[PDB]
Amino acid sequence: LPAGATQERTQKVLNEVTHYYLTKEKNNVESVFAVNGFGFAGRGQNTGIAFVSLKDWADRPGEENKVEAITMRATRAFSQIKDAMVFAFNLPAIVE
């Protein structure tokens, strides 16, 4: 979120992110561990992160159920979150 944003506002955005994975990606997402106040910044009232674990590859048959399509759909849904930058992404083979 923009600096100046409150921990309470960041929590509201995190709730939306969590809600999305828990309800719209039921078949794909096993768990969400969301952290308010920590990002790659790190610390701050106006930042957060969600770690997402997917169900096993075998239960996720098809392109639409792989990470690239999941993260793309998610980012798209999250684009309609007010006053926040929220995006899901797959790590690269080698960040470096």
Binding site: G4, A5, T6, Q7, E8, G37, Q45
Partner: protein, 96 residues
């Protein structure tokens, strides 16, 4: 001597008036829920110029007269030390 002051008084005033203070925040964590504002409080910051050092207040006299640092000292940018002086072919120089 004229002002009944010593280098101790000068050093004490410089430490007090050339200072950089951690002053905390308005609306910092943990907040009262419902807080809308979060802002850093900025108190004293380091002085940046000879002018600022010169008006450091050493004391005010009984008749409201003020004794400023510039009243007991010359204030200027100058070397941390004055032991090394180089010349290149007889002309003033520095170097590494």
């Amino acid at each position: 001597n004229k002002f009944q002051l010593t280098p101790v008084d000068v050093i004490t005033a410089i430490k007090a008036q050339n200072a950089q203070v951690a002053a905390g925040q308005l609306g910092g964590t943990p907040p009262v829920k419902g807080q809308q504002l979060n802002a850093s409080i900025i108190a004293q910051t380091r002085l940046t110029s000879t002018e600022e050092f010169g008006k450091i207040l050493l004391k005010v006299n009984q008749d409201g007269s003020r004794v400023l640092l510039r009243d007991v000292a010359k204030i200027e940018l100058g070397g941390e030390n004055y032991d090394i002086i180089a010349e290149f072919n007889g002309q003033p120089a520095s170097g590494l």
